[PDB]
Design a protein around this ligand. Structure first.
Ligand SMILES: CC1=C(SC[C@H](NC(=O)CC[C@H](N)C(=O)O)C(=O)NCC(=O)O)C(=O)c2ccccc2C1=O
Ligand SMILES: CC1=C(SC[C@H](NC(=O)CC[C@H](N)C(=O)O)C(=O)NCC(=O)O)C(=O)c2ccccc2C1=O
Lengths: 327, 327
């Protein structure tokens, strides 16, 4: 599933990467949207924050797109950023504006039917992956960003003066601590579960899966000491941990065979999971149907049957007391 | 894949229709070992219980085979019954005498290569599945029985005058309850994990896995009232349930997608599991290396990578108190 020099290549990708790692737009969509329209640290201006200009294209299944939705909720960005939700099933073409599936909405702007359409509608000679989430500029018809880690930093502050809800999920004091955390939590866990669930060899799988539980144990301990990863405050590290956690019992445990312990077995990790979940307007950003149809039904490499498991038992509404406990 | 009128048939079993519920060989081997050599209810006579004559061919991974090993220990039949353990791994020619794998012993009698050869040595023109366990008559060079449910009833009485340990696992007073439990357990549970695992449609899976957890729940009430399924007496219905229980967290949970609850989440089922496991002599009949290699690696249909999940944590040695709670 890549788009090469403007044409879709289903999965006929391909017959030897002949020089190689592609290419000049392996991320040419890394602009920032800004309070004043100035350029961010990469990319170009003038993406100034304002209402009725911006649009988020996402899956409800993807942990990477899910952080942008969480952020849009916590920051009160609903009146600023309207949303389209691709179909959960990622087959031959890639993400799909296939409606039908409850909560998949079609490309509700320019009703394409492929996410690679939209990426071309903004570079028709584009060479690279066709990913969610996509931060889209209704005005200049292109892609501000398709990088979830940055889109969430835009949301963190770019709208503050236009009346976003209060909250700074990357405050200077903690940016160091947050950055170290984002780092290992990405290797060992955000990525850890995909590495394990897509292992080729058994020694690869043991490798990944062992790392996954070595980090679960280490995080169980930190959470642990204080309500969240860095202490008493919610930060973007927590939200990024969280998008993986909420998927772990319903999917990564049986489907990616990370099956040594369920999250609901750790006191603190499970407490954390329920804590963030119960924050207001966070539950509605969680769709288990898209989560489970997507992973079970799309990864025929791994689950030839497309049979979706009954799924580990869990009640995320169970009061957690992490607000009392801490600190 | 089957044996067809004498020849080993890898997969293609065989000419689809044109014959024939498989087959004049379904007629199975269903003789009885009896104390006096009279025939049982099926087959012929002349299988008199006696030392040095009879042999058991098992897999250590299968729960049908496991039954006959448990019954062999509880009844103290080791002096009369020697054992060969196929190899865990069901390649293209079903069960195999490959002894590379620890605990896999090769054909301790006839050093054939393949279990199906044993069936051929007892029958040039055999046509049926080639299963474990096999109860082998060294003297006549044929198969007494390849039916685990009957084999254990023969172990339960046939050697009673030759020094078998006292013990009836199917006493006349409990038979009608045992026959009901057996029926319900084999359908929804010993077999239920298989119907769910190898379902083909979401729907057939949904129905199978539902019935599993619904039976587990009822078994959990039952085992909350007394040590064993029918009271304080251990019976063949317990043994039959237990050999599926013991495989459940290591394999069926993840490999057959019977997730939702692990056995170790049930107070009573999990106590019951540890209770039987810890009986003098039982623990040695359990081999997780075989159990887990067999299911993960042999079922390429269902687990293509043939990777063996790290597996749900459990510790069966921990004290259970069911000797005393009751009852
Ligand atoms: C993530 C992930 C997927 S599905 C979700 C995915 N998310 C990302 O994009 C991560 C970075 C991102 N740009 C940002 O930080 O926002 C996407 O939307 N699609 C992929 C595609 O179509 O290329 C997969 O299916 C797979 C399969 C095999 C190995 C690894 C993988 C693998 O690692
Ligand atoms: C049972 C069972 C198996 S497990 C291994 C099987 N054992 C028996 O069934 C016992 C024979 C007798 N009835 C008993 O009471 O002992 C045998 O050794 N081999 C099967 C073969 O090689 O054909 C399986 O693997 C499978 C797979 C797919 C669908 C159903 C099934 C399915 O139903």
């Amino acid at each position: 599933g890549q788009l090469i020099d403007g044409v879709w290549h289903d999965t006929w990708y391909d017959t030897k990467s002949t020089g190689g790692k592609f290419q000049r737009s392996a991320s040419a969509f890394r602009n920032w949207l800004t309070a004043d329209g100035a350029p961010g640290p990469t990319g170009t201006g003038g993406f100034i924050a304002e209402k009725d200009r911006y649009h988020l294209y996402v899956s409800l299944a993807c942990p990477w797109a899910h952080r942008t939705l969480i952020m849009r909720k916590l920051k009160g960005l609903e009146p600023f950023i309207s949303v389209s939700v691709v179909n959960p099933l990622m087959l031959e073409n890639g993400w799909t504006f296939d409606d039908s599936f409850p909560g998949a909405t079609g490309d509700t702007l320019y009703q394409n039917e492929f996410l690679y359409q939209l990426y071309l509608h903004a570079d028709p000679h584009y060479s690279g992956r066709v990913t969610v989430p996509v931060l889209w500029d209704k005005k200049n018809h292109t892609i501000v960003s398709n990088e979830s880690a940055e889109i969430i930093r835009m949301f963190n502050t770019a709208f503050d003066a236009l009346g976003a809800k209060a909250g700074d999920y990357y405050p200077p004091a903690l940016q160091t601590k947050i950055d170290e955390l984002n780092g290992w939590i990405y290797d060992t866990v955000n990525n850890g579960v995909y590495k394990a669930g897509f292992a080729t060899s058994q020694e690869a799988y043991d490798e990944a899966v062992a790392k996954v539980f070595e980090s679960l144990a280490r995080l169980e301990q930190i959470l642990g000491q204080h309500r969240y990863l860095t202490g008493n405050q919610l930060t973007e590290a927590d939200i990024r941990l969280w998008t993986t956690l909420v998927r772990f019992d319903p999917v990564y445990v049986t489907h990616f065979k990370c099956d040594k312990h369920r999250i609901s077995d750790y006191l603190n990790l499970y407490g954390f999971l329920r804590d963030i979940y119960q924050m207001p307007g966070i539950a509605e950003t969680v769709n288990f149907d898209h989560i489970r149809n997507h992973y079970f039904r799309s990864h025929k490499t791994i689950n030839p049957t497309g049979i979706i498991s009954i799924g580990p038992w869990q009640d995320l509404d169970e009061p957690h007391g992490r607000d009392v406990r801490f600190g």
